[PDB]
Structure 1
Amino acid sequence: PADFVPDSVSGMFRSHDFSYLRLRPDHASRPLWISPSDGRIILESFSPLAEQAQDFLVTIAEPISRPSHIHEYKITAYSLYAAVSVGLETDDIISVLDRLSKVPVAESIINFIKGATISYGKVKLVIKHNRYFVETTQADILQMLLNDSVIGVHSFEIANESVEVVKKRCQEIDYPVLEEYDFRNDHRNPDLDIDLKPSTQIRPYQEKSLSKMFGNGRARSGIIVLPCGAGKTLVGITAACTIKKSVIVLCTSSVSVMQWRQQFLQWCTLQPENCAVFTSDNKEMFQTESGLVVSTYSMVANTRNRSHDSQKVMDFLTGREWGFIILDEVHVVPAAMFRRVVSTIAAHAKLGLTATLVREDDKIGDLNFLIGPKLYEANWMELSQKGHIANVQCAEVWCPMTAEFYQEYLRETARKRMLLYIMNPTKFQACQFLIQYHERRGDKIIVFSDNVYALQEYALKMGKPFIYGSTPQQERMNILQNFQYNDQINTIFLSKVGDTSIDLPEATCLIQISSHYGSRRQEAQRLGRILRAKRRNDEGFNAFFYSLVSKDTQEMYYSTKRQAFLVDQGYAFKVITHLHGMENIPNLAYASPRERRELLQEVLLKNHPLIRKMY
């Protein structure tokens, strides 16, 4: 910024006027705009070299939003740490950035890349016989690590529990640690001979994801983010198949444990002998040299009360030095005690698999040192147009509450306010009319409702099956099987239980009467259920995703906040003020005033052997 006359409209831009720089004549070809201060990147998706830089930019810059035409990216310290890992130096980044940037890379941006791109590659953490050694390739690091107030060719031991502390210390200090596993030269750990059968097929986007993880030839530790239904299960299977070592899978559900094992058996060639499932039902552990354990975070994260049956398994897990760990739905690993499994379980490589990499609290960034940086992220829109995932016509239906109910809405306290507007009569009519309309079309409908009481009320009146936490595994499976293979039943009423890692290929339509406040991942994960549509390639097919919201209620504040992640991905929500043909439906719930008042009162009222013969 030297000798540049401000414009009369420069006042409107509060220090954001970046016109001080000039533009080269080759602006017609260069597809990258760079903000000299904020680090933001604006990418043209309708210009030559778009595909040329679509992969280079993703590696260096994380995506904040990738709508149809103009893609938005931002460069951050964490993003650079991921990029520098895969054989990238400042010189290469600077040379390519200038070759592609319409506007010159400012000194501030140049300074930012220099600082964070030079630290990588001077400290490594290795594991030997369940003993963790902070090995360094140069002796100069001893004067920096051993003298650290937190800690405690040269190699020194470090406590397993202290790993969660030193890794954060590594981020704070200049040198961050990298977890690279040389499986090729690792012979001490017994190998597991498994390869994908010929029937298997590797999709290009998955192939790119695997390449980002096996770029240098040594297994990396990080996170792979793919849209729901992209096939993350096969990505984990391929990673397990190529490493050919002891592996384990952790999932935060019981039904999903069978799903992962079922996919594992069919895709790869692992024999049933080497696979053991550690759940509440069975706890036997494989005695063969090497195998797989598909367990849940609850079983491995428990510390206080472990019984004899589970205690023996825990000793077996801890005693042996494993090679790989798979964390399905890794967006819940940095929790208070779910993160303990990473440290307690010894493994030379860690993989994270979550469709959504966001959470309400600011602990999402902690995944960098719990499991590693972000390796690859796949755009939802690109896969959708390629026929790999289904298209969804997201809609938001506005249901104005009736006057009688709204009268109690103002007075009622917030705690009971939720229950008040969740069972408003208008939403019943919309849900019933939409369900009937889609049932006539021949659509498999899934109804989600976080509130158990509302879920029961909907099902009891509508005479449709409902599933919630109290139901057993056998009953829910029977309901699920009936909903899939039987033509008689085409709609089910699910709850928060099936919000994640559930495969419903036949599901095409989804309705959400009321859900979990401001949570965003719930909105996206639930949307992933209908992204599984088997008939996602037939012409004119469009999955339906509805979110009934009461007008003039806090649900609008929650609804607009929870769907803030889908808009970033690219999905757009349509407002439906009125449903055509809804009045001509023969019967509707609570049509007469008498029935409406009956509902209002009920919801308002909610809150010695000898002696034995005598008797």
Structure 2
Amino acid sequence: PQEAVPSAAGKQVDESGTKVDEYGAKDYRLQMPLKDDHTSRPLWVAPDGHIFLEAFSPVYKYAQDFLVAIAEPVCRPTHVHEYKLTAYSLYAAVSVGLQTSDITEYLRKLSKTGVPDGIMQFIKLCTVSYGKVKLVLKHNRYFVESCHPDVIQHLLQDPVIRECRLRNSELFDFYEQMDKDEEEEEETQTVSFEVKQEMIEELQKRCIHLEYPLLAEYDFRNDSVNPDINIDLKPTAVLRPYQEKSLRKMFGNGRARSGVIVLPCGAGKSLVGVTAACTVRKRCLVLGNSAVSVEQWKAQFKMWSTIDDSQICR
């Protein structure tokens, strides 16, 4: 159990026996209670997860960013936009640090209709447990961390999880480089412990089963044990703003935030990947469906990175 199956595959909130009218439209006038400020509230929150936005609304700028950060885009014509809520779209919002209350409050504030309880339930189901805890990997130490001790305290009550924790501490630094000693700054909002090297594989199932998926982050920079290959980007590599933000989203905290990146065909997708590899400066495994991608990557690495034919291998 690692795919967080329930909200993804079970989709508890998908309607059945929908009150489809004679015209064939879903009659949600009754399901979506009428609410005031039809001119100031730019959203419609359909109970099936679809959301509609007005590109001409005065708050469209914020509402667009709001929907872009919370829902998957469907269509963006000149005057109206369509978005669809999904567990993965919601989990992406949670991992950014957005709270269920804030999401519900701003939705209720921007929605022309009251938010349907089924969508509010889907919001809860996809925000309460979906990403409140992080699995740091620094110095080869698997540290489990959460912004709130409340989340880990509940998690730590699990006897199987308790068997995973390791009693270790970790040091500071010397005057040669006492920033690692000054890394004791901001231990507020920070609580973590090490987990035994081999328990992770089983603990992951247990935490996801326990409804607390771990946000794994690899601290490639301070990991001393995995040797660096001095990988670096060629001056030919210039990051486009979307690429820069995509990497910012990934490396924003400083560690490689594991996850999925979506880049439409034609983007400098390879430049983003090569930059990520050049940023990690650790040995990288790359997977494709054909030897063509393998040599296509190799050629793109040659043009944007220092990595040699003694170092890139098919």
Counterpart mapping for 1:376-455 below 5 A: none
Distance in 2 (alpha carbons) for counterparts of 1:196 and 1:210: 14
Partner residue in 1 for 2:255: 218
How far did residue 175 of structure 1 move?
0.9
Mean CA deviation greater in 10-19 or 224-233: 10-19
CA change 1:134–1:206 in 2 (3 A) is closer
User: Is 2:29 the counterpart of 1:17?
Assistant: yes
Distance in 1 (alpha carbons) for counterparts of 2:235 and 2:109: 43
How far did residue 236 of structure 1 move?
0.3
Partner residue in 2 for 1:388: none
CA change 1:100–1:207 in 2 (3 A) is farther
Counterpart mapping for 1:110-509 below 5 A: 110-119=120-129, 120-122=131-133, 124=135, 126=137, 135=144, 138=152, 140-144=154-158, 146=160, 153=193, 155-158=195-198, 163=201, 167=204, 170-268=207-305, 270-272=306-308, 275-278=311-314
How far did residue 166 of structure 1 move?
5.7
Assess if the C-alpha contact under 8 Å between 1:134 and 1:156 holds in 2. Answer: no
Partner residue in 2 for 1:600: none
Task: Name structure 2 gaps, 5 residues minimum.
Answer: 1-19, 147-151, 163-192
CA change 1:18–1:180 in 2 (3 A) is farther
Identity of aligned residues (%): 49
Mean CA deviation greater in 175-184 or 91-100: 91-100
Residue-by-residue CA offset, 1:372-405 (whole Å, 9 max, x unaligned): xxxxxxxxxxxxxxxxxxxxxxxxxxxxxxxxxx
Distance in 2 (alpha carbons) for counterparts of 1:274 and 1:49: 55
Q: How many residues are matched?
A: 257
How far did residue 81 of structure 1 move?
1.6
How far did residue 266 of structure 1 move?
1.0
Q: Secondary structure at the match of 2:313?
A: strand
Q: Secondary structure at the match of 1:124?
A: strand
Partner residue in 1 for 2:6: none
Distance in 1 (alpha carbons) for counterparts of 2:136 and 2:285: 21
Residue-by-residue CA offset, 1:207-239 (whole Å, 9 max, x unaligned): 232222223332111111111111210110121
Partner residue in 2 for 1:82: 92
CA change 1:20–1:57 in 2 (3 A) is closer
Distance in 2 (alpha carbons) for counterparts of 1:139 and 1:76: 29
Partner residue in 1 for 2:101: 91
How far did residue 252 of structure 1 move?
1.7
Assess if the C-alpha contact under 8 Å between 1:10 and 1:17 holds in 2. Answer: no
How far did residue 87 of structure 1 move?
2.0
CA change 1:50–1:214 in 2 (3 A) is farther
Partner residue in 2 for 1:546: none
> Which amino acid in the other structure matches residue 203 of structure 1?
R
> Which amino acid in the other structure matches residue 156 of structure 1?
K
Distance in 2 (alpha carbons) for counterparts of 1:134 and 1:183: 14
Assess if the C-alpha contact under 8 Å between 1:170 and 1:177 holds in 2. Answer: yes
Partner residue in 1 for 2:48: 38
Assess if the C-alpha contact under 8 Å between 2:51 and 2:82 holds in 1. Answer: yes
Assess if the C-alpha contact under 8 Å between 2:136 and 2:144 holds in 1. Answer: yes
Counterpart mapping for 1:46-57 below 5 A: 46-57=56-67
Larger Rg: 1
Assess if the C-alpha contact under 8 Å between 1:86 and 1:215 holds in 2. Answer: no
TM-score by length of 2: 0.67
Distance in 2 (alpha carbons) for counterparts of 1:38 and 1:203: 36
Residue-by-residue CA offset, 1:146-176 (whole Å, 9 max, x unaligned): 179xxxx36234368xx3x764554343211
Q: RMSD of the alignment, in Å?
A: 3.4
How far did residue 265 of structure 1 move?
1.5
TM-score by length of 1: 0.37
CA change 1:71–1:192 in 2 (3 A) is farther
How far did residue 251 of structure 1 move?
1.7
Partner residue in 2 for 1:68: 77
Mean CA deviation greater in 138-147 or 177-186: 138-147
CA change 1:216–1:266 in 2 (3 A) is same
CA change 1:194–1:29 in 2 (3 A) is farther
Q: Secondary structure at the match of 1:146?
A: helix
Partner residue in 2 for 1:455: none
Distance in 2 (alpha carbons) for counterparts of 1:181 and 1:224: 17
* Higher relative contact order (Cα pairs below 8 Å, separated by 6+ residues): 2
Q: Secondary structure at the match of 1:260?
A: helix
Q: Secondary structure at the match of 2:133?
A: coil
Assess if the C-alpha contact under 8 Å between 1:86 and 1:216 holds in 2. Answer: no
Residue-by-residue CA offset, 1:12-48 (whole Å, 9 max, x unaligned): 56663347522333x334432211x222211233444
> Which amino acid in the other structure matches residue 21 of structure 1?
P
